[PDB]
Amino acid sequence: DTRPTIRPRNDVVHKQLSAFGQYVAEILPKYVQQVQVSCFNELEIFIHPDGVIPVLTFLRDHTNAQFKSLADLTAVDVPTRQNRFEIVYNLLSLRFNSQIRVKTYTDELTPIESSVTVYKAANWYEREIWDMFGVFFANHPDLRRILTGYGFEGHPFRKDFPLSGYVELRYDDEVKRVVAEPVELAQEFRKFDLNSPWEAFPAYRQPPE
Amino acid sequence: AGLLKKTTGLVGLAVCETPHERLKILYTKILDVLGQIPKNAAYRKYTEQITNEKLGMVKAEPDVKKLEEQLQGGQIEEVILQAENELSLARKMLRWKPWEPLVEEPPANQWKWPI
Amino acid sequence: SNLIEVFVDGQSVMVEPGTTVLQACEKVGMQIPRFCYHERLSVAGNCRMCLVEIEKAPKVVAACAMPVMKGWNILTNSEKSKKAREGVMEFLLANHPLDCPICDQGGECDLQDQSMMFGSDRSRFLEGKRAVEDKNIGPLVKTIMTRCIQCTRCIRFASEIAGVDDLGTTGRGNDMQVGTYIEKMFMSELSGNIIDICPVGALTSKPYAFTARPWETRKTESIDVMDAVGSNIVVSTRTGEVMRILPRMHEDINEEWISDKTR
Amino acid sequence: ASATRVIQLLRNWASGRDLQAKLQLRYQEISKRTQPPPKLPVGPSHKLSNNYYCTRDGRREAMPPSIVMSSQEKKAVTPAPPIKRWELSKDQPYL
Amino acid sequence: GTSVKPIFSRDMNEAKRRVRELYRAWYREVPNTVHLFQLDISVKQGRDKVREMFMKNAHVTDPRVVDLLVIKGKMELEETINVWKQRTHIMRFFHETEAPRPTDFLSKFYVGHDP
Amino acid sequence: RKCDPHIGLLHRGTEKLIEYKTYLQALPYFDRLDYVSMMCNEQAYSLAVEKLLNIQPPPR
Amino acid sequence: YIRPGGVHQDLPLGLLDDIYEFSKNFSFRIDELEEMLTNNRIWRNRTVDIGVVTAEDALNYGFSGVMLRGSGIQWDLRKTQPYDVYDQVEFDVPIGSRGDCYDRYLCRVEEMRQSLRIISQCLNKMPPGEIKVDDAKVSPPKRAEMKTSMESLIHHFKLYTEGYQVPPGATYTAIEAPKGEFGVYLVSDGSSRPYRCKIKAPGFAHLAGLDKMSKGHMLADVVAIIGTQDIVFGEVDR
Amino acid sequence: TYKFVNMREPSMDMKSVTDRAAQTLLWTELVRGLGMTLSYLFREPATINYPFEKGPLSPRFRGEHALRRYPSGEERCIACKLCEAVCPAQAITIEAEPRADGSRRTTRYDIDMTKCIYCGFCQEACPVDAIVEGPNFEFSTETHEELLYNKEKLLNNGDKWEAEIAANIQADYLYR
Amino acid sequence: GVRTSPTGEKVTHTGQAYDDGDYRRVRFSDRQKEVNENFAIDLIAEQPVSEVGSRVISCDGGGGALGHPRVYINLDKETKTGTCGYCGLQFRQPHH
Amino acid sequence: TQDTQLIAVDEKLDITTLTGVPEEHIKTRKVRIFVPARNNMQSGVNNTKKWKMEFDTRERWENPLMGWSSTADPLSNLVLTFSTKEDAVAFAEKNGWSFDVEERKVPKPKSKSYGANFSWNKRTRVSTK
Ligand code: SF4
Ligand code: SF4
Ligand code: SF4
Ligand code: SF4
Ligand code: FES
Ligand SMILES: [K+]
Ligand SMILES: [Zn+2]
Incomplete structure (x- = not known):
C-alpha cells in the first residue's frame, strides 16, 4: 500500500449501492425526494414524513431489499432548518449484508405515523425519541416516558434545554423527602471556543449566496 | 423430493412437504396482484421480471436440494416468506400508489448539512 | 461596467480591475493562507504563504501581489499550490522557538492554526536554530522577538496608522531583527494595537501576561466608554473577571483597532 | 502447587482432569516485572523525503456524499451480491 | 404554509373538547391519590392546583399545541394513579421547600442584582 | 402475561454531554457507557471516527 | 486504550507471554464452569424451554448478535462485515437449536472457546508495526519528538486544545459487541466536536423484546429470562 | 464457518436407555457437579491478604495525582493550560x-x-509532564472536602510520592 | 523558605494569606493548613549559574527526553543572564 | 398539495407553552443574535459565517471554599448556530424570547496596489518594506 495511512476507498460496492439508489427512487417516486450515497459507501434516501410506512414496509418486504434488521431510529435537532427535528432510521439486510438509512424532516407539531407497524422492534425507540427530543409519533401503542425523571418537564436532548438542567435534587429534613430545587452549580461548565478560526477542509465549502 | 427436512434450523419456520406447488401457486397470486398495476409503474417492470424468471426457474427444476441454490434464497422454507409478503407488499401499494411525482419538494434548506 | 471576468477553480466570478488574487477569491471565500498582508494595511508579499500557482502557467504567483489578468483561473486547491504553501510553512517554522505551551498566542496563534489546516505532520530539521535578544518596548507590550517571523506587519503599523517614524527591520539574513536598534520607547496612542496585528507571540500584551487562555474566555460584545468615539470592542470574561479587551471591526468608528487606554 | 502427591491424586480423581500442569493461578512462568528498555519503531510516514502531507492527505480526500437523484428497460439490481451459505466447521461438525 | 397539519384536533373546539375530558378526569382520582400516597394534603389543594396550571397555559390559540398539552396531561395522570410516580414526584408541584422569592422592584433590588 | 419495565435508574447525559466535548474527550464516555465490556465500546467509537476521517490505522 | 487512529500506547515487553500463560489454562477453567453449570439436571431444566423466540419474531424485535445466533439465525458481524483485521482470523459462530435460555448458553460458552482461538491466532500473528497512524493531525505525536520538533509541538498543542476536525456527515457503524450489535450513529458538523452521537445499544434493543420474550412464564423465571439475555443497566439507557 | 451447539441425537439402545435411566435415577451428572467441587476445596486459595500483600500493578498505573518538579527543585507546571x-x-x-x-x-x-476519571489524558497532555498520577490508590477519606485538592496538596503529593513516579516514568517514557 | 502571618497562618509561595477578618478560617481550626515547605520562587536562588561560551545554547531541562522542549536562549544580552523560561534555571555568558 | 387535513391557523409559532422552560427563564431572559467578531489577534474568518444565539450574562458569585465561580443561571452556557437571521429570529418566536438582532458587518472592499508603495508624489509611498 503506497498510502497505508488513509483509508482505502471501495468503488465496486459504491456502484451497486448507487444502483440501488435510483432503484428505490424509481419504485416509490412519491416520497423519495433525494437519494444520496456517502464516500463511506453508505446509502441514504431522503423521504417525506407522510409516506414513511410505505417506504419502510416496501424495504422490509421487498425480495430484492429484505432490510428487516432495524438498527435504530434517532433525531438530530438542527434549529437552523424550518423542520428542526430530523427522524432517522437505520436498517440492515441479512441477505445483502448492507445498511441503508432513511432520513425525514419534522417539526414540533407534525406527528409521524408510528413505525411500530413496519418495525415493531422500535416500540421503545419512540418512547425515548418523544422523551429526549419531544417529537410525538402518531397512532402509537404507548408513548410513555422511560428515559428521564418522573414528572420531568421538557425535552433535554433539544438544543434549547441546557446541559446543566432545570431541577436539582436534595434531601430535606423538613419534608423527609428528596425535594426539587432550581439548579445551582458550585462550578459552571466553562464554555470552550474550540472551533478553529481558519478555513477547514475545502471540500465541504458552502458556496455563498 | 427426498427426505423431509425435520430441522430447518430457524425456529418457528415450518417445513412444508409441498414446497414446489406452494411456490408456484404463491407466484401466481403475486403475478395476479401485479396484473392490475399499470404498465408504467416501476413495481411492475422490476418485480414481475424477477417473479416470472423465478417462477420459470422453480418450474423447470423439480428437486428441492438443488433449487435452494438456483434461487440462492437460503432454504425453501423461507423463500416463500419474502414472496408471501411480496404478495402482501403489492397489496400495500395497491393503496399507497407512489408512482406519481413528489408529494411536495422538501424545504429549500432542509437537506445539505454542512452548517 | 469594467468588472473583468476571472475564474476561480473554474468557477467564473466578476472582479474589479486591480483587485488582488487574495481579494479576488475573497468574494466567494477562500482566504489563501497569509501572514504578511493585512486588509486595512499595505501589502509587502513577504511571508510567501499566500503563494498559489496560477493555471496553465509554470510559476506560482502571490495571492496578495498580482491583481488579475483576464480569465486567469485561480487553482486554489491545486496540488502544486499545496506544495508551495507547505514548502514555505516548514521554512518560517524551522527557526521558530518551541514556545507554544509558554507563548500567550497558544490557542489563538495564526501560526498554530495554519500548521494544522495547511501544514505538515512532522519536521525534517536536524540543525541548530536562531535566537533573538528581547528588546523591551514597554510595560504595556511584550517583546519575545525571538518568535518574530519577520512578516513586517508591525513596522507598517508604525509607519502608517500610528504615524510614528519608528521600529523597522535591522540586520539581515537569518539575523534580520525587527526592532528599534537603540532602545527607543513606543509611546503612541495606538501602540497597544501592535498586539493584535502580530500573528505570533513576538508581541503580546504585558498587562494580560498569561492570566488565561483563548479557549476559555467567554467573549462579550460591548463598546469603548473612555472616549466619545464609542469604539466597538470584545470583552474577555472568565470565572467572573475581565482579563483583556479586544477591538472589534466597525469600519468608520474604529476600523480594526482602539486606543491604548481602552485596551 | 505445593500439596503432597496423595492429595493431588484426590483432587485429580475427583475432577478426572489434569489440574496440576494447568493449575489456575500464576507461578514462576510470568515475565519479570523488570523488563529491557523498548525501542519502538517509526511510523509508516516517518520519511524525511518525498513525504508531502498532500500525498497522504486523508482528511480532505473525503468528498461531500455523492448525489444520484434529486427532486430539485434496465434490469433490477440488488444492492450487494447476496451472501453465501456458510459451511459447517471443518474442525468439528456439531457439539 | 400557514395551513398547518392537525395532530388530532382541526380547531379550538375539538381541542377544547379534549381539554374538558382530561380536566374532568383529573379529579376522579385526586381525592384518592392522597389516600394512596399517604399524603398530608387536603383534596381541595389538589383540585385548585390542577386548576391553576391550567390557567398557566390558558393563553395559546393553536389547536395543535393545546392538543399536545392535553395528551401531556393525559401523559401525567396515569403516572400517579398506578403508583408509578413517587411521593417527591407529585410533591414537586406542591412548592414548599423552595425559598420564598421577592416580587416587587424594591425587594428585587434589596436581595441582589438579578434582573 | 405483560412485562414492561421502567428504566432511567441509570439514565445519564451521554449524548447530551458528548456534544460539548471533543471526540477525544468523548472517548471516556464509551468506556463507561456499558459497565461490563469496556474495550469493545472504544472499538465502535474509534472505528466510527476513523471512518469519518478516511484514515486507516496501521496494520499492527 | 482504543483511540481514533490506532491504539494509544504499545504493549509492555512480556504482555504477550502473560496472555499465553493465562490462555493455556483458560479452557481448563471454562471446563470447570462447563461440568457443573451445563449438565446439572436442575440447571438444564431451568434453562431449557424457559422462554423462546422464533426466527422472524427475534429478527423483527431488533435482536442481533448472539441473541439471533442462539435462535438459529445465521448472521454475525464478525464475518459478514469483517471490520478491522477480522477477515484474517478463523472462528466458528455458535448457531444453536430452538433458542431458549439453554440454547444461547451453549452458544455463549462456545463463543469463549472460539474467542480463545481468535486470541491464539492473533497472539502468534502480532506484526512488527506501529500503534498509531502517522498523521499527526489526528494522532498525538510521539513524546520523544514532541519535545524536539515544532510541528509535533503545534500538532500536540492544537490536538490537545480543540482536537482534530472531522469532516462533516453522518455515519452509523456497528461492531459485534460481546453482548449484541453495538453501533454509534454520530453526526459530524465539520467541527472539532460531534453534533449528536446516538448509540445502538445492544442492551436497549434486546430489552425491547422482553414483552414477547416472557409470554407465559412464572415470576421466578423473569430473572432467568433476563439471564439468557444481557441487560446491563448501564448500557440499556442508550 | 459455523458450528451447531445443541443438536444431538441420543442413542436408543438398551444400554443407552439404561445409561440415561441410570443418570436420572442414580444421579451421576449431579455427583460430577459435586465431584470437581472437592477438587476446588483441596486447592490453594488465591486470597491476597491486605495490607500485608498487594495485587500486582504496572509502571503505568494511574492514581492519586502529584505535581512534580525539576531536579534543581523548581515546579514543572508551566501553566501551559x-x-x-x-x-x-x-x-x-x-x-x-x-x-x-x-x-x-x-x-x-x-x-x-x-471529578476526574484518572484518564491519563492530563499526563498525556502536559508537555513537561508536570501533572502525573501517582501509584497510590489508597487515599480514601471521610469528609468530601479533603477530596477537593488544591495546588499545595498537589505539590505535597509530588514531594511525597517522588521517587516512585520518577522511577515509573523513567521505565515507561520509552513506550510513551 | 516560608514566612509567617499575623495569625501565624503560614503563607504559601503564591502569597495566599487569610486575613484576620475572613470567616473562611474556621476550616483551619482544629486542623492544619497545608503549605509546601519548599518554595519554587527561591529554589532557583541557590542553583548555580553556568558560563557557556557560545551565542545561543539549547536547554532541555536535563534528562534527555525527560525535561522540557529544546527551547533556545540567546546569550548575548549582558544585563541579566538569559533564563530559559521552561527550565527556570539560567545560563551565563563568560564575556568572551 | 397535502391532503393531511389541511387546516389554516395563523398563530405565529409559540411552542413555549410546551417547551418546558420555567416561567422565570422565558420572559426576563433577553436573547441576542449576531455573527461572531473575529479576534483581531487572528486573521482567520471562519467564525464570521454563522449566526449564534446567546443569552444575557447573570451574576457569578465566588464559591467560599475554594473560589469556584458558582452560577445559578442554567442558561448561561447555551450558544446555538444559525445560517441566517430569518431562521434565527424564527427560533426566537417559536420559543417566544425577547430578541435583539444585529445585522452583520461585511468587509468593505479596500483598494490594494503594491505599486502605490513607490509613488511619484502620492502619500501611499512607504519608506520601508
Ligand atoms: S507564536 Fe510561536 S510559540 Fe506562540 S503559539 Fe504561535 S507557534 Fe507557538
Ligand atoms: S514583531 Fe510581530 S508584527 Fe512585527 S514583524 Fe515580527 S511577527 Fe510581524
Ligand atoms: S499541562 Fe502541565 S504545565 Fe500545563 S497547566 Fe497542566 S500541569 Fe501545568
Ligand atoms: S485530565 Fe487528568 S485530572 Fe482530568 S480526568 Fe484526565 S487524568 Fe483525571
Ligand atoms: S500574504 Fe501574500 S505573501 Fe504574505
Ligand atoms: K501578537
Ligand atoms: Zn530550561
Missing part, C-alpha cells in the same frame, strides 16, 4: 499570574479529585 482543554470531566482548574521573577507558575491548580 493544556490539561484543562483535554480534561474530559473539567476537574482541573488552572489560573496563573506572573511570579516575582516572572516565570509563570499557576496560582491555583485544584484537581477536583471527585
Whole structure:
C-alpha cells in the first residue's frame, strides 16, 4: 500500500449501492425526494414524513431489499432548518449484508405515523425519541416516558434545554423527602471556543449566496 | 423430493412437504396482484421480471436440494416468506400508489448539512 | 461596467480591475493562507504563504501581489499550490522557538492554526536554530522577538496608522531583527494595537501576561466608554473577571483597532 | 502447587482432569516485572523525503456524499451480491 | 404554509373538547391519590392546583399545541394513579421547600442584582 | 402475561454531554457507557471516527 | 486504550507471554464452569424451554448478535462485515437449536472457546508495526519528538486544545459487541466536536423484546429470562 | 464457518436407555457437579491478604495525582493550560499570574479529585509532564472536602510520592 | 523558605494569606493548613549559574527526553543572564 | 398539495407553552443574535459565517471554599448556530424570547496596489518594506 495511512476507498460496492439508489427512487417516486450515497459507501434516501410506512414496509418486504434488521431510529435537532427535528432510521439486510438509512424532516407539531407497524422492534425507540427530543409519533401503542425523571418537564436532548438542567435534587429534613430545587452549580461548565478560526477542509465549502 | 427436512434450523419456520406447488401457486397470486398495476409503474417492470424468471426457474427444476441454490434464497422454507409478503407488499401499494411525482419538494434548506 | 471576468477553480466570478488574487477569491471565500498582508494595511508579499500557482502557467504567483489578468483561473486547491504553501510553512517554522505551551498566542496563534489546516505532520530539521535578544518596548507590550517571523506587519503599523517614524527591520539574513536598534520607547496612542496585528507571540500584551487562555474566555460584545468615539470592542470574561479587551471591526468608528487606554 | 502427591491424586480423581500442569493461578512462568528498555519503531510516514502531507492527505480526500437523484428497460439490481451459505466447521461438525 | 397539519384536533373546539375530558378526569382520582400516597394534603389543594396550571397555559390559540398539552396531561395522570410516580414526584408541584422569592422592584433590588 | 419495565435508574447525559466535548474527550464516555465490556465500546467509537476521517490505522 | 487512529500506547515487553500463560489454562477453567453449570439436571431444566423466540419474531424485535445466533439465525458481524483485521482470523459462530435460555448458553460458552482461538491466532500473528497512524493531525505525536520538533509541538498543542476536525456527515457503524450489535450513529458538523452521537445499544434493543420474550412464564423465571439475555443497566439507557 | 451447539441425537439402545435411566435415577451428572467441587476445596486459595500483600500493578498505573518538579527543585507546571482543554470531566482548574521573577507558575491548580476519571489524558497532555498520577490508590477519606485538592496538596503529593513516579516514568517514557 | 502571618497562618509561595477578618478560617481550626515547605520562587536562588561560551545554547531541562522542549536562549544580552523560561534555571555568558 | 387535513391557523409559532422552560427563564431572559467578531489577534474568518444565539450574562458569585465561580443561571452556557437571521429570529418566536438582532458587518472592499508603495508624489509611498 503506497498510502497505508488513509483509508482505502471501495468503488465496486459504491456502484451497486448507487444502483440501488435510483432503484428505490424509481419504485416509490412519491416520497423519495433525494437519494444520496456517502464516500463511506453508505446509502441514504431522503423521504417525506407522510409516506414513511410505505417506504419502510416496501424495504422490509421487498425480495430484492429484505432490510428487516432495524438498527435504530434517532433525531438530530438542527434549529437552523424550518423542520428542526430530523427522524432517522437505520436498517440492515441479512441477505445483502448492507445498511441503508432513511432520513425525514419534522417539526414540533407534525406527528409521524408510528413505525411500530413496519418495525415493531422500535416500540421503545419512540418512547425515548418523544422523551429526549419531544417529537410525538402518531397512532402509537404507548408513548410513555422511560428515559428521564418522573414528572420531568421538557425535552433535554433539544438544543434549547441546557446541559446543566432545570431541577436539582436534595434531601430535606423538613419534608423527609428528596425535594426539587432550581439548579445551582458550585462550578459552571466553562464554555470552550474550540472551533478553529481558519478555513477547514475545502471540500465541504458552502458556496455563498 | 427426498427426505423431509425435520430441522430447518430457524425456529418457528415450518417445513412444508409441498414446497414446489406452494411456490408456484404463491407466484401466481403475486403475478395476479401485479396484473392490475399499470404498465408504467416501476413495481411492475422490476418485480414481475424477477417473479416470472423465478417462477420459470422453480418450474423447470423439480428437486428441492438443488433449487435452494438456483434461487440462492437460503432454504425453501423461507423463500416463500419474502414472496408471501411480496404478495402482501403489492397489496400495500395497491393503496399507497407512489408512482406519481413528489408529494411536495422538501424545504429549500432542509437537506445539505454542512452548517 | 469594467468588472473583468476571472475564474476561480473554474468557477467564473466578476472582479474589479486591480483587485488582488487574495481579494479576488475573497468574494466567494477562500482566504489563501497569509501572514504578511493585512486588509486595512499595505501589502509587502513577504511571508510567501499566500503563494498559489496560477493555471496553465509554470510559476506560482502571490495571492496578495498580482491583481488579475483576464480569465486567469485561480487553482486554489491545486496540488502544486499545496506544495508551495507547505514548502514555505516548514521554512518560517524551522527557526521558530518551541514556545507554544509558554507563548500567550497558544490557542489563538495564526501560526498554530495554519500548521494544522495547511501544514505538515512532522519536521525534517536536524540543525541548530536562531535566537533573538528581547528588546523591551514597554510595560504595556511584550517583546519575545525571538518568535518574530519577520512578516513586517508591525513596522507598517508604525509607519502608517500610528504615524510614528519608528521600529523597522535591522540586520539581515537569518539575523534580520525587527526592532528599534537603540532602545527607543513606543509611546503612541495606538501602540497597544501592535498586539493584535502580530500573528505570533513576538508581541503580546504585558498587562494580560498569561492570566488565561483563548479557549476559555467567554467573549462579550460591548463598546469603548473612555472616549466619545464609542469604539466597538470584545470583552474577555472568565470565572467572573475581565482579563483583556479586544477591538472589534466597525469600519468608520474604529476600523480594526482602539486606543491604548481602552485596551 | 505445593500439596503432597496423595492429595493431588484426590483432587485429580475427583475432577478426572489434569489440574496440576494447568493449575489456575500464576507461578514462576510470568515475565519479570523488570523488563529491557523498548525501542519502538517509526511510523509508516516517518520519511524525511518525498513525504508531502498532500500525498497522504486523508482528511480532505473525503468528498461531500455523492448525489444520484434529486427532486430539485434496465434490469433490477440488488444492492450487494447476496451472501453465501456458510459451511459447517471443518474442525468439528456439531457439539 | 400557514395551513398547518392537525395532530388530532382541526380547531379550538375539538381541542377544547379534549381539554374538558382530561380536566374532568383529573379529579376522579385526586381525592384518592392522597389516600394512596399517604399524603398530608387536603383534596381541595389538589383540585385548585390542577386548576391553576391550567390557567398557566390558558393563553395559546393553536389547536395543535393545546392538543399536545392535553395528551401531556393525559401523559401525567396515569403516572400517579398506578403508583408509578413517587411521593417527591407529585410533591414537586406542591412548592414548599423552595425559598420564598421577592416580587416587587424594591425587594428585587434589596436581595441582589438579578434582573 | 405483560412485562414492561421502567428504566432511567441509570439514565445519564451521554449524548447530551458528548456534544460539548471533543471526540477525544468523548472517548471516556464509551468506556463507561456499558459497565461490563469496556474495550469493545472504544472499538465502535474509534472505528466510527476513523471512518469519518478516511484514515486507516496501521496494520499492527 | 482504543483511540481514533490506532491504539494509544504499545504493549509492555512480556504482555504477550502473560496472555499465553493465562490462555493455556483458560479452557481448563471454562471446563470447570462447563461440568457443573451445563449438565446439572436442575440447571438444564431451568434453562431449557424457559422462554423462546422464533426466527422472524427475534429478527423483527431488533435482536442481533448472539441473541439471533442462539435462535438459529445465521448472521454475525464478525464475518459478514469483517471490520478491522477480522477477515484474517478463523472462528466458528455458535448457531444453536430452538433458542431458549439453554440454547444461547451453549452458544455463549462456545463463543469463549472460539474467542480463545481468535486470541491464539492473533497472539502468534502480532506484526512488527506501529500503534498509531502517522498523521499527526489526528494522532498525538510521539513524546520523544514532541519535545524536539515544532510541528509535533503545534500538532500536540492544537490536538490537545480543540482536537482534530472531522469532516462533516453522518455515519452509523456497528461492531459485534460481546453482548449484541453495538453501533454509534454520530453526526459530524465539520467541527472539532460531534453534533449528536446516538448509540445502538445492544442492551436497549434486546430489552425491547422482553414483552414477547416472557409470554407465559412464572415470576421466578423473569430473572432467568433476563439471564439468557444481557441487560446491563448501564448500557440499556442508550 | 459455523458450528451447531445443541443438536444431538441420543442413542436408543438398551444400554443407552439404561445409561440415561441410570443418570436420572442414580444421579451421576449431579455427583460430577459435586465431584470437581472437592477438587476446588483441596486447592490453594488465591486470597491476597491486605495490607500485608498487594495485587500486582504496572509502571503505568494511574492514581492519586502529584505535581512534580525539576531536579534543581523548581515546579514543572508551566501553566501551559493544556490539561484543562483535554480534561474530559473539567476537574482541573488552572489560573496563573506572573511570579516575582516572572516565570509563570499557576496560582491555583485544584484537581477536583471527585471529578476526574484518572484518564491519563492530563499526563498525556502536559508537555513537561508536570501533572502525573501517582501509584497510590489508597487515599480514601471521610469528609468530601479533603477530596477537593488544591495546588499545595498537589505539590505535597509530588514531594511525597517522588521517587516512585520518577522511577515509573523513567521505565515507561520509552513506550510513551 | 516560608514566612509567617499575623495569625501565624503560614503563607504559601503564591502569597495566599487569610486575613484576620475572613470567616473562611474556621476550616483551619482544629486542623492544619497545608503549605509546601519548599518554595519554587527561591529554589532557583541557590542553583548555580553556568558560563557557556557560545551565542545561543539549547536547554532541555536535563534528562534527555525527560525535561522540557529544546527551547533556545540567546546569550548575548549582558544585563541579566538569559533564563530559559521552561527550565527556570539560567545560563551565563563568560564575556568572551 | 397535502391532503393531511389541511387546516389554516395563523398563530405565529409559540411552542413555549410546551417547551418546558420555567416561567422565570422565558420572559426576563433577553436573547441576542449576531455573527461572531473575529479576534483581531487572528486573521482567520471562519467564525464570521454563522449566526449564534446567546443569552444575557447573570451574576457569578465566588464559591467560599475554594473560589469556584458558582452560577445559578442554567442558561448561561447555551450558544446555538444559525445560517441566517430569518431562521434565527424564527427560533426566537417559536420559543417566544425577547430578541435583539444585529445585522452583520461585511468587509468593505479596500483598494490594494503594491505599486502605490513607490509613488511619484502620492502619500501611499512607504519608506520601508
Ligand atoms: S507564536 Fe510561536 S510559540 Fe506562540 S503559539 Fe504561535 S507557534 Fe507557538
Ligand atoms: S514583531 Fe510581530 S508584527 Fe512585527 S514583524 Fe515580527 S511577527 Fe510581524
Ligand atoms: S500541569 Fe502541565 S499541562 Fe497542566 S497547566 Fe501545568 S504545565 Fe500545563
Ligand atoms: S487524568 Fe483525571 S485530572 Fe487528568 S485530565 Fe484526565 S480526568 Fe482530568
Ligand atoms: S500574504 Fe501574500 S505573501 Fe504574505
Ligand atoms: K501578537
Ligand atoms: Zn530550561
